[PDB]
Amino acid sequence: TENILRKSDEEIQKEITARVKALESMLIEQGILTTSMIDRMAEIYENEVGPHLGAKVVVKAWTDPEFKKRLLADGTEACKELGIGGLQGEDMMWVENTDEVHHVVVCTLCSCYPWPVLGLPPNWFKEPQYRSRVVREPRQLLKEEFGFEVPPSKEIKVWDSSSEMRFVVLPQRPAGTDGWSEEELATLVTRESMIGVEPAKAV
Amino acid sequence: MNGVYDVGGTDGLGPINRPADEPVFRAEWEKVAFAMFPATFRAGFMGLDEFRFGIEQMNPAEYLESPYYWHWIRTYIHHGVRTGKIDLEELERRTQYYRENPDAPLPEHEQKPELIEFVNQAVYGGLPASREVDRPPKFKEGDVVRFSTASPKGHARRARYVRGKTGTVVKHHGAYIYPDTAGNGLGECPEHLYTVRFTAQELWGPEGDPNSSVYYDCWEPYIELVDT
Ligand SMILES: [Co+2]
Secondary structure (H helix, E strand, O other): OOOOOOOOHHHHHHHHHHHHHHHHHHHHHOOOOOHHHHHHHHHHHHHHOOHHHHHHHHHHHHHOHHHHHHHHHOHHHHHHOOOOOOOOOOEEEEEEOOOOEEEEEEOOOOOOOOHHHHOOOOHHHHOHHHHHHHOOOHHHHHHHHHOOOOOOOOEEEEEEOOOOEEEEEEOOOOOOOOOOOHHHHHOOOOHHHHHOOOOOOOO | OOOOOOOOOOOOOOOOOOOOOOOOOOOHHHHHHHHHHHHHHHOOOOOHHHHHHHHHOOOHHHHHHOOHHHHHHHHHHHHHHHOOOOOHHHHHHHHHHHHHOOOOOOOOOOOOHHHHHHHHHHHHHOOOOEEOOOOOOOOOOOOEEEEOOOOOOOOOOOOHHHOOOOOEEEEEEEEEOOHHHHOOOOOOOOEEEEEEEEEHHHHHOOOOOOOEEEEEEEEHHHEEEOOO
16 A cells, blocks of 8 residues: 555665564674575475465365264364474364354464464465454455355354464365365465465365 | 554455466565574574564564565574574664675675574474473363463563453363563463354454354463353
């Protein structure tokens, strides 16, 4: 949105870059930050940890009723069965979409997000536009921003991550997928479907 | 505190900006900002709750429109200055230096295996905030409770939109680090944690969505009993 007071994006980037390099130089001199530490963190969340992990959890729940029960009982412990867990998903609570209930998750106070199953959040999740509106007008927001119409008779539950409990949505399994393999099913599972802003992919 | 960061329920912030796709890191400075979190955490700049509180103290106009990882930079500097680990005047001088000399090298330094080990352990092992306490939980599933109207200036997880609102206890989780102490440098002082369900009409008034609720996590001191 227009702000006549705001510098260009290019000027903002130039200034941030200098500030960050300056701070970086000082933390390096203190011996608490190194180039390898930086590269390792980046590599993990660029290449290793991402929503393909949550997808594996989802499709196991879809194809294994006992695992699904365990997942809903204790998200952290269930995900550890798949070697999935860790930073900012130490405490996971999965919630199940049904014909009667739709779940959507938010961190209104900041940006909290279940990194071990979804990786780092997309910028829109962290930004004030989504965070402000989704607790107040979720039905309208889902329709207008995501093209996702939840009938008024269906309950929408919005989960605001104010604690270290991390909420993850188990989307409903799309129709027409009877007997599909876990690999085939995983193609239907999106980051968005595990946030609750979209259903899993149809067809 | 009652900061602008507490945006739940705020109107007029504009349409969602959602590019069809986007990289994890949009610029090299973002990678650096991100990796600075375990670095400053290990070095004792701040814990997680304190980290959040630093961001909450930003210039609100800057908060609302700056790139996300800039928030992280602000809180590192805030806590660096707070703890005396960062000299502001030196930081300002170095900022001007890298303004004028953007391709100047970073300081010579040794790599440290222990920092890689820290990263790996933190990422895959986590930093769990769950704690054992001696007191039993005060509340249980089904309890109807009311959220505190307290308005601390210091850090808390008390979104304005739920203050004074009633709600039904949905799940007790166990005890966790308490933000109102931890974020203010007063220690973990753990408290039992509950998810509480608030109807949309309770939150937003008589015209609210009759078929929507918001689930919000409440530490024990945040809530007091209405109907058991
Ligand atoms: Co957050």
